[PDB]
Amino acid sequence: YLSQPRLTYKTVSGVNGPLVILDHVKFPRYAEIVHLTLPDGTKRSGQVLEVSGSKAVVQVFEGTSGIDAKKTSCEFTGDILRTPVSEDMLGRVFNGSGKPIDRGPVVLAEDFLDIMGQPINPQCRIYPEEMIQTGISAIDGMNSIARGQKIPIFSAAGLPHNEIAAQICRQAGLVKKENFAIVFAAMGVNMETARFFKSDFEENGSMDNVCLFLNLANDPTIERIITPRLALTTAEFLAYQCEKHVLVILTDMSSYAEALREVSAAREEVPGRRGFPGYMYTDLATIYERAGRVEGRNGSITQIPILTMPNDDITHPIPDLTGYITEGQIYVDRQLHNRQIYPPINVLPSLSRLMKSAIGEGMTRKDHADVSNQLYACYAIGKDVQAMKAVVGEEALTSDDLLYLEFLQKFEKNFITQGPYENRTVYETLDIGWQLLRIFPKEMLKRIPQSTLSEFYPR
Amino acid sequence: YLSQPRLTYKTVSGVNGPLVILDHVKFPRYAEIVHLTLPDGTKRSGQVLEVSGSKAVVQVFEGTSGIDAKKTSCEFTGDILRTPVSEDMLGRVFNGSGKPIDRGPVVLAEDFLDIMGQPINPQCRIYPEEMIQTGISAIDGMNSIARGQKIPIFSAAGLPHNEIAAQICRQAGLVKKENFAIVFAAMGVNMETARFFKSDFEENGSMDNVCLFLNLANDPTIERIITPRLALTTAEFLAYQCEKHVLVILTDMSSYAEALREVSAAREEVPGRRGFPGYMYTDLATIYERAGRVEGRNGSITQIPILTMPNDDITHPIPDLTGYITEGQIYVDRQLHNRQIYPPINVLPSLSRLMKSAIGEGMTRKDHADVSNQLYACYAIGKDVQAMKAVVGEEALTSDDLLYLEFLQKFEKNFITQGPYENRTVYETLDIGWQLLRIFPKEMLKRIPQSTLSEFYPR
Amino acid sequence: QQKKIQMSNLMNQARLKVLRARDDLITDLLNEAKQRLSKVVKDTTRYQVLLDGLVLQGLYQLLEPRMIVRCRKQDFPLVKAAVQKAIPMYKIATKKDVDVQIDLEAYLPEDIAGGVEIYNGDRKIKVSNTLESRLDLIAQQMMPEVRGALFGANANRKFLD
Amino acid sequence: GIKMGGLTSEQYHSQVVGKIGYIARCMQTIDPENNLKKIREDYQDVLIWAEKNYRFEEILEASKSGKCPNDLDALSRRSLILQELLRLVSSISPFKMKLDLIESQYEKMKQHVNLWKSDYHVKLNQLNQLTDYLKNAAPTPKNNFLRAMTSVLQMQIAQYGITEDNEGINQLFKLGLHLLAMANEKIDEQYHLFKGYVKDQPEESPFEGILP
Amino acid sequence: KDRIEIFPSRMAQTIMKARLKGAQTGRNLLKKKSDALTLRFRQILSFVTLDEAIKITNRRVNAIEHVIIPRIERTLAYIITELDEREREEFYRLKKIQEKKKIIKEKSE
Amino acid sequence: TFGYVHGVSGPVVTACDMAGAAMYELVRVGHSELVGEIIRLEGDMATIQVYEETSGVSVGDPVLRTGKPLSVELGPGIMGAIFDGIQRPLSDISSQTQSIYIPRGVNVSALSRDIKWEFIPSKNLRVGSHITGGDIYGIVNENSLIKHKIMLPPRSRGSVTYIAPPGNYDASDVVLELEFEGVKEKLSMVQVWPVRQVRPVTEKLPANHPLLTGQRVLDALFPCVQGGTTAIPGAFGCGKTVISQSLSKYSNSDVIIYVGCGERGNEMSEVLRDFPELTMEVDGKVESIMKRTALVANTSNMPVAAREASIYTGITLSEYFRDMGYHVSMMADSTSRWAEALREISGRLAEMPADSGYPAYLGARLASFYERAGRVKCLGNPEREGSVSIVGAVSPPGGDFSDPVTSATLGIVQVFWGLDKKLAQRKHFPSVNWLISYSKYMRALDEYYDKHFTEFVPLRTKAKEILQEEEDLAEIVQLVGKASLAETDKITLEVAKLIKDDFLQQNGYTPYDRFCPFYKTVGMLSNMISFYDMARRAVETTAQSDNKITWSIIREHMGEILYKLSSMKFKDPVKDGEAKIKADYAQLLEDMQNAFRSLE
Secondary structure, eight states, X not given: OOOSOOOEEOOEEEEETTEEEEOSOSSOOTTOEEEEEOTTSOEEEEEEEEEETTEEEEEESSOSTTOOSSSOEEEEOSXXXXXXXXXXXXXXXXXXXXXXXXXXXXXXXXXXXXXXXXXXXXXXXXXXXXXXXXXXXXXXXXXXXXTTOBOOOEEOTTSSHHHHHHHHHHHOEEOOOOOOXXXXXXXXXXXXXXXXXXXXXXXTTOGGGEEEEEEETXXXXXXXXXXXXXXXXXXXXXXXXXXXXXXXXXXXXXXXXXXXXXXXXXXXXXXXXXXXXXXXXXXXHHHHTSOSEETTOSOEEEEEOOEEOGGGOTXXXXXXXXXXXXXXXXXXXXXXXXXXXXXXXXXXXXXXXXXXXXXXXXXXXXXXXXXXXXXXXXXHHHHHHHHHHHHHOGGGOOHXXXXXXXXXXXXXXXXXXXXXXXXXXXXXXXXXXXXXXXXXXXXXOTTSOHHHHHHHTTO | OOXXXXXXXXXXXXXXXXXXXXXXXXXXBTTEEEEEEOTTSOEEEEEEEEEEXXXXXXXXXXXXXXXXXXXXXXXXXXXXXXXXXXXXXXTOEEETTSOBOSSOOOOOOSEEEETTOOOBOXXXXXXXXXXXXXXXXXXXXXXXXXXXXXXXXXXETTSSHHHHHHHHHHHOEEOOOOOEEEEEEEEEEOHHHHHHHHHHHHHTTGGGGEEEEEEETTSOTTHHHHHHHHHHHHHHIIIIITTOEEEEEEEOHHHHHHHHHHHHHHTTOOOOGGGSOTXXXXXXXXXXXXXXXXXXXXXXXXXXXXXXEGGGOTTSHHHHXXXXXXXXXXXXXXXXXXXXXXXXXXXXXXXXXXXXXXXXXXXXOTTHHHHHHHHHHHHHHHHHHHHHHHHHOSTTOOHHHHHHHHHHHHIIIIIIOOOTXXXXXXXXXXXXXXXXXXXXXXXXXXXXXHHHHHHHSOO | OHHHHHXXXXXXXXXXXXXXXXXXXXXXHHHHHHHHHHHHHTSSHHHHHHHXXXXXXXXXXXXXXXXXXXXXXXXXXXXHHHHHHHHHHHHHHHOOOOEEEEOSSOOOOTTSOSBEEEEETTSOEEEOOBHHHHHHHHHXXXXXXXXXXXXXXXXXXXXXX | OOOBTTBOHHHHHHHHHHHHHHHHHHXXXXXXXXXXXXXXHHXXXXXXXXXXXXXXXXXXXXXXXXXXXXXXXHHHHHHHHHHHHHHHHHTTTTSOOOXXXXXXXXXXXXXXXXXXXXXXXXXXXXXXXXXXXXXGOOOSHHHHHHHHHHHHHHHHHHHHOSSSOOXXXXXXXXXXXXXXXXXXXXXXXXXXXXXXXXXXXXXXXXXXXXXX | OOSOOOOOOHHHHXXXXXXXXXXXXXXXXXXXXXXXXXXXXXXXXXXXXXXXXXXXXXXXXXXXXXXXXXXXXXXXXXXXXXXXXXXXXXXXXXXXHHHHHHHHHHHHX | OEEEEEEESSSEEEEESOOSOOTTOEEEETTTTEEEEEEEEETTEEEEEESSOOTTOBTTOEEEEESSOSEEEESTTOTTOEEOTTSOXXXXXXXXXXXXXXXXXOOOOSSOSSOOEEEEEOSSOOTTXXXXXTOEEEXXXXXXXXXXXXXXXXXXXXXXXXXXXXXXXXXXXXXXXXXXXXXXXXXXXXXEEETTSOOOOSXXXXXXXXXXXXXXXXXSSSOOBTTOBEEEEOOGGXXXXXXXXXXXXXXXXXXXXXXXXXXXXHHHHHHHHHGGGOEEESSSSEEEGGGSEEEEOOBTXXXXXXXXXXXXXXXXXXXXXXXXXXXXXXXXSOHHHHHHHHHHHHHHTTOOBOGGGOBTTHHHHHHHHHTTOEEEEOSSTTOOEEEEEEOOEEOOGGGOXXXXXXXXXXXXXXXXXXXXXHHHHTTOSSOBOSSSOEESOTTTTHHHHHHHTSSHHHHHHHHHHHHHHHHHTHHHHHHHOSSSOOHHHHHHHHHHHHHIIIIIOOOTTSTTSSXXXXXXXXXXXXHHHHHHHHHHHHHHTTOSSSSOOOHHHHHHXXXXXXXXXXXXXXXXXXXXXXXXXXHHHHHHHHHHHHHHHTTO
């Protein structure tokens, strides 16, 4: 351990935006944490983002308003932000700084883990081969969730992405026909959203297995880019040291990206698109890739990093770079929500990278893969027919086209529409698939071999 | 008065483009006016833009060619740029620097005002009331100018925006159901147009009520920045201290904006949107908002900024930032110009937000509001019918459509087309309106109440 | 039609004519003031008092470790006294020891009404502290009150703020 | 950043010291003779800290150390109950309420799930609206009618309280507030409304013995 | 497909805006043609030739509205965004140039 | 406490000998005392951003350091006054100088010290008692409407050592003294709070009580709740005045704050001229609105720091009264003008721009601004409650919704009162678009509506269904002319018209329709929908064969009933009391049902 007394400085050189620059510092350490006291007694903390000679640049989490130049007192902890973690953090509510806000005590650590974490050795990483039953046909059928998968929900402001995440928390089980520890990072949200989830977790009777980290819209913007790491660090303890299956949900990741963009501008870093740092991808990978199973240990981490798409732009850097890192996305939209369809999940632009391993003989039912692929073909064609008919008129369509409109209309109300408390099995979802696919004659079901149609199509 | 002897420095650290960097200067002021004497006896003016300790940096109004760092002397005045103002300067012609160019004497001041001035205290600002007629029917019976509003003329390059501006100066005045003056400032005007303005005002006897400032395209670009400040400083003196109504016309604000961009570059500021300063918004507001009525005084200032739209795109920062902080627009078109209609003002895209208060009983005539609304509807319909005629032909039109075509042709020929030397007062403009409206039978004039029709429609 | 243009030119030039005449009256008054200042500097005790003040104001504005006073040759005896008195007064006011010399090799043109010029040690900074320059400086800054005193107040000006 | 609710560590315990002193002050203000023994007992855990000089700092330390009943939510609800009882007797100050009724009203308020949103709270707010208006009121028919009706309202509450719903008091509340909102320029409507009350009142002399 | 695929430029903005204005004018003129045919059609009710002319005109109008203009608007919005992205990278370089000049100036003192 | 000016590069002033200064502190630069803030610091030098023109500032000028950061001065006299965005009284500057200009470097105290206020102590406190932050120790009598409760400043506590007796005190005197750990603090009636800091509360509560505006539309169909946040489009022709006047005049809130951000001079004049002329009946007396209102005025040519700070000054004033237990409703005239000011400062500081040129933190600033609204449990032992509502408007260039400022705002506010200009051209007021507008508080208010009115909730659901169906049928009607149209659809179309004409439309220039009490709004809607349901049944239950009822038969049969439904808006609450209007509506329902009965 660190037995040497820490040093305290009153040597602040200057302040520039969110960065407090100290001089006369003895052997500065990179990415070490500094605790500072303002002339009025206010205590704040920050991290050294640069060292050079006797100088060090400290980014202050709470902010730099009120930071003095002569009376400011800073002390260097001598290490990186290692945070206290314990098993009994489940059932506690913390803020974005890692401190409790539930009137309980501070964390009585079992160990101290580096918030930055470490990359998992790809040779010991074990490829996920188990499916989670979300109960939502729009997901379990056509975009299955594996245990250890990273699947964000791409959403847009005003859409019920909070209700879907809340639903998933209660009715997420297995298809092996199980209590997930949930770590929920509520960052960049209003009180009502955080209270909605907090209340739902108690309503579900599962609060003793839920760890919350809150960082609300009125909280500092710099803490908003460690909150995910605090959640994941706890998840890593629980999953990889105590073999507990953990579900980690990160609320609108766009508030993370916007908080990061503010830091990028302050540090004059090289922009990429829309003003975001050119290293945004690398930073996101540090957050997202803390997931998956590890060989030889019985734990897992599954992520659902829901994000809001600015202006419904699927090519915005936030959903774009996320799409490159995560194993696909669920994607909800306004065209379904504006018709009172719940959950408003649009399967067409969605995918699950681990879905192919998750389905089929030994996992769900042998026809799973065939039903999904044909439903995608029929749904997409129905959308193409609507694009045509909008111009040429119904009279210009033939029987081959009307069948896809019949499918499209029945698909959305039978397959996607469910309700907040409709919990379907994966087998029931496929059965529904067949009920819709049987709208077409065998010759049009071109994604399914006759070795499958001959068994399932007749019913 | 100061009564402090001036200091003249021969200490020059260097010269860089329009800037001269001085040394060992005693307690220099920002925005201080200084005078240079070159080795050839040539005198130049300049203004201090930066004072970093004893190193004052002065921008020279004229070119810096011929200036050395050994013999050139710089005399400091100890004060900032303050313009001598009087009533007598009305009827004079000045250049951008405030010097006479009409072979008359230097202004014999009644006071000295800081040309930057101060914002008018909103608590004493009076909402605009009566109307100031321009003499141009297209903007008296359709989009009148309230006595206190600020309504810009947007034009494309090549359109007769300067001829209209001159026509307004010759014709504009009070309704007259001796206390009205016009202050005219041209920024970046070429030699041929500068002659046009000067001679056209003198020859037609209007000069007695015009204070004319000419900043020519080849004049110092910094002088172009104070030019509108000198014009407004005069307007504020005349309007608010001498109890009279002043119309201020700022011609070619786009050329002003270009000179402002040059000043920003001189300060080595990083350009903002489309190359323009990030403070272009507040700079334009600083100019525009020094107008309107004030509590307890009978004076007023109106403004008609005139702006060339680059590439005829209203989206461009210059007309965009102006329109965002002005009340409506006149809008000069190109199609009307190519059709040899003068003035070429398009009433359909124009708007005067204050027209509701400008006109009506006690200000112009009872029927003013009703005639304007009906003429607008009839013109919009006539254009719509004309577009239809091009598709269906003359034989496919009904009697009502033919009446609207008759109106359209006679509206443009009688109401919009005027000529530069016909001064149409508000009452003649309305009478012309009725002559055009009496084309239609009463039942087609849906926007005019029956009481107004019975009084005005016949005869 | 052409008669209207002729009337415009006649009225516009007539306006300039009377304005130019008024500016000549101001110029003549300023010229008389300069001649009256010439009569003042022809005095001894009154002029020496002006120099005592002018030298002090020169020193206070320049604030350099070394200064040279340049004057008209015939005024040297009076400036010498002004400098000898100005120095101990300067030191008390500014708490800076400044070596003040008088230029005995170069002199101001003899046609200058009076006053001094003050140079710093390297002759790179000069103070325009001559009598004629001070008069022009004050006469211009005070001109708004001269206008009113001679020709009357502006009857249409109701607010002086 | 303990951020317990909206308060930080120092603010949380500072608000606890305030609420404890406040309850002690309210108890002495509502019952200066200490007659209401049952009600006092319900607050003994916060009244035990009264009649001691802690200079704030020692009672603040007791809260931080955990010797005081420092649960903020329990103090909020229990404090509200006491001060609403104080308003009940304070707003009817011209009349004395029986001690047995004060304890009854206390228990009925204490049993309410959410006293702030109770009808008892609303009725007390309407009473203060009517009694605050009259504090600085000019002589005029309207204000004489309101004062006469208010004194009866205060007299009746002193006898029935607020939790024990009574149609007579409820109708008087409605009539008083409707009169209060009556236009000051209109005389006939406020006149007929007052007389309507007086003749409909079950008794024969509604103000006899109620007001001077 | 989704865009006209004209490389982002101020010239492209001018062309696309003129193209959009043309498409909108054609849409309105063809809509008037359709309305005139529809009124004449209803007045008659050389009858089937009007029903064919209306179906052809409305189909073209619908395509302008559902295919051609949306595509021009997507192209124009794409151009506008990409041009602001180019403006930003110029801002970055100019800012860094100004800072490097400031550093050189400090070293000289 | 003084430093010196080292140099001026424009609006940015570099100070030296200013070691003892904190970031975002306040300075008064030069002999004119120009207002500015310290942003960058290095060594004993500081970089000052000056709000006003720096012309004339010399090297060697003094700089006076003020310990408080940008803060709002809070105390008696705040009500009825008009403030600059940085808390400068415009009504005193114009009256203490006799000028029309705001003097450069003007220094007028936010609250005058020549007023002798009537102060009454709480009468509960004694010397030696314990007081904490948020506690009320006395009330100042300002006017007939709002009592100004004097609270202990937040982040202060201790034992009370002096209490001023009841009497006349000005804002410079000492009213209460308290001692904490031997440190004595002397407090006047005025407290100062940094404008960028959120005033603490005991707890943030859910918003359940409706905001009872006087309009039938923007209430029945699109509710707002006390403590909630909404957005209002701001276009010349949208008729935003109707909401501003209705909200400030007849709302059930206690205190109104109107915040300008940076509008056209003539627009600020119209607001400043209109507001003093507004009145409302209170206790039967007609009182000026300015006795329970405060206003912040900023024109487009005001210092950008004030235009940017105006929005935070307004909400700081709002929270100040929130902490008194009042319900406060603040309107931001244009948050687009604020965002413009914010972008200007970011540009001036050469910050890296983001979306459409706006600062990277635009969204964070809007989110943290709106998060400050809500119903709260206040600080202090009085266990009082209050709320702040925000009805800030948006006016993006071009009227588009793609602008990051409007897009971000709509993702934050829970209610959108989308207005339109087409409706205004048709003379239909209030100009509410209906199809664009939404409210996300409908669930929060279900408890209130169930407790007090019961039938309101299914009625508003049916009302939206009828209005939406009218839009859905529009294409069928256009291509058909109501010929090949179901009689049940004709009922929907004509009843939807009735709703649009004689319910959602409201004429505020009539004395009977100035304010529509909720019980009247639900009364009118109940009878209209009850008619709708009866008309649907009259057709559907008889539509089998032989003898069927059609809309033409219903309309001709009971034309007096359809008229009586339209006549319901004329029931003047000022003359016809609650019982009479409800009785007349009950009789209408009976006459209505009986008219249909004769058809079966």
